Write a protein that binds this ligand. Sequence first.
Ligand SMILES: Cc1cc2nc3c(=O)[nH]c(=O)nc-3n(C[C@H](O)[C@H](O)[C@H](O)COP(=O)(O)O)c2cc1C
Ligand SMILES: Cc1cc2nc3c(=O)[nH]c(=O)nc-3n(C[C@H](O)[C@H](O)[C@H](O)COP(=O)(O)O)c2cc1C
Lengths: 350, 350
Amino acid sequence: MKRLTYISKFSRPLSGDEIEAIGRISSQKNQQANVTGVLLCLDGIFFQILEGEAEKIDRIYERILADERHTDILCLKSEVEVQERMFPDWSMQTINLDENTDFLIRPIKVLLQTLTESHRILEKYTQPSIFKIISQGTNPLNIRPKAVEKIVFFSDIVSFSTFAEKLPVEEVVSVVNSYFSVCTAIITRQGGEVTKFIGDCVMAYFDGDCADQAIQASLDILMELEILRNSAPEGSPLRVLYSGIGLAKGKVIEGNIGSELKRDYTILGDAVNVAARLEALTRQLSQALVFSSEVKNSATKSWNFIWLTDSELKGKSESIDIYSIDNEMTRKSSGGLEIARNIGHYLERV
Amino acid sequence: MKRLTYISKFSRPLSGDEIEAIGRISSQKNQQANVTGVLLCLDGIFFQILEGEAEKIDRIYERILADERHTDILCLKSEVEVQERMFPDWSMQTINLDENTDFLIRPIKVLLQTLTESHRILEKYTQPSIFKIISQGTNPLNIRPKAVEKIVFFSDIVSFSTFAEKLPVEEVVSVVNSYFSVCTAIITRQGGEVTKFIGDCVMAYFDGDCADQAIQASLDILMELEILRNSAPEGSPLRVLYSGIGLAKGKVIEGNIGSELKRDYTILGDAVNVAARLEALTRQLSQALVFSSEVKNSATKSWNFIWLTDSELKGKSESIDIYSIDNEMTRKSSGGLEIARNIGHYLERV
Ligand SMILES: Cc1cc2nc3c(=O)[nH]c(=O)nc-3n(C[C@H](O)[C@H](O)[C@H](O)COP(=O)(O)O)c2cc1C
Ligand SMILES: Cc1cc2nc3c(=O)[nH]c(=O)nc-3n(C[C@H](O)[C@H](O)[C@H](O)COP(=O)(O)O)c2cc1C
């Protein structure tokens, strides 16, 4: 069997009516599915454990994930090899701790709340891959390191030092965070993982056979930033927000990397360095998107590739053929590299 | 008043005897201090809330932090402006949920456990600064960005690409993690903050008036790595583990930086770039530790400074005078840059 534990937050205040309406329907649907477990209610927070056949659990959780009466739904635990039920006589016992006033319940209830709100804080500082892994039934702490092929993505804000020199600190952070949010949303939707931010830089990666999605994600970022630039208020620093992007391909190590008290689940390898060095050349090459011939040849769609140059850094003393894609968006975004050379006056006056 | 909530793990199995011995003494000491609250016991895990005068709470928590009967002690919440007690009639009610078998207690107990073990996982992926902030009574999510002077620290493993080419993936990660652990331990003890790992690189920072501690931390890292090298088993990759270190000083932005779902509490600014670019020059300059004249002049101890060169990168078209310190350890560590140029054969045979 499968057992799922999740927490969520009320989307909006819920009445006494609506809460037992939820318990009523859940218990009826679970009874029919031979699913058991507990739904707990505490100060605008839901906790639920559900157990049964994996196929039925998955369809139930799918509806739960779509229910607009709660949000911020987070799976804390997924066990997919359960031999014995934890809550057998109850299709869906609902328990409401708000109305509760039992005696040793009161200390446990404030404990539950403080643990949950502390957990919500830590969630904001946690890589999204960690919660994905947990939702697949895997403890991330026990993943062993592996060699894997990846497409590595690296991007940054053009002339970011000008933003930091000219703007108040709150506006610098607003710009960076806006940029990071655009990139993260598109990368995640295209099947990639944003694994690190460093300075105003984004490091991300895609599966090794997903060069098409990496390229499409890069073009979508450029398109979204175009929308953001031309939709921003007059005088806004967002009007001169441009990105460079570099993609590389290679075998890297994936796993838990860090000190004893603080690790990241992330990647390590030469392709990370190549992607960052290619991204650095966007300015000199007058191309907003640059990638290696290995990325180019690994792609299977008929992108309009343009050869840029043959050069190198490193390290390994090997030359690399560098490509972009030639379309209206990359031409406009590449022109933005030039524009961003002299945005100091524009930024001085926001 | 002040109210503290923390969790901990048993250091070792604790008997029925020892647990009420803890409750017995705690209740007696709290009664004398006019401290109230609750200590909860659940499957080798402690939860406690304590409330009272800040000075008495701090002295009590100090003893709790020293008690070898528990470990992994983590403050989830510190409220330092409490006007009203949450648990007034009880100096230290102790509650043991293991022995408990009440009816709606059972679902809440498995909930408490799953929340706690999920929290413990997330702790391993969380910057240490976040828990420090929480322990000071501050929610990190509501810190506003600020401009602050910092000394920025950047370091990496010399010829790391050779380790990744020659060693099995498990041994590559073991080396990197060992290095990261050495650096983090020393930096934290010297009052700094390790804020990011990228590749085999460590980024950290110290208060702007703490150049002496930054320099001492750097020298201690070099000394610890010497101990690690000369103490490692024969043939071990750790025998050829060397570091470069660069320090820079400047005004940076500190605050929450990232996408909507994932942020870091970290720094942003030119001094980060300068520190990384200085660290990159360690090889060309044949000096394991390099730093800017601003770091040099900001220090107040009589380090044996040696001027290295006048050069630049950037960006800003300004030259920088680069320094090191000349002692036996930096000479030996700098010689290690040369040794690390040709460790491929040594590493091929581990
Ligand atoms: C907090 C919460 C918990 C829920 N738990 C369950 C559940 O355990 N089983 C279930 O069938 N529906 C549960 N639901 C309701 C589903 O989201 C959905 O409303 C219902 O199952 C779909 O019914 P339908 O088959 O007519 O579409 C829950 C809803 C909420 C808000
Ligand atoms: C889980 C746990 C909770 C404790 N809580 C308290 C407490 O609330 N108040 C207290 O005085 N001691 C508490 N202690 C015990 C202290 O660590 C320490 O043993 C004792 O207070 C010191 O007594 P002393 O003044 O003779 O040194 C706790 C110990 C443990 C293991």
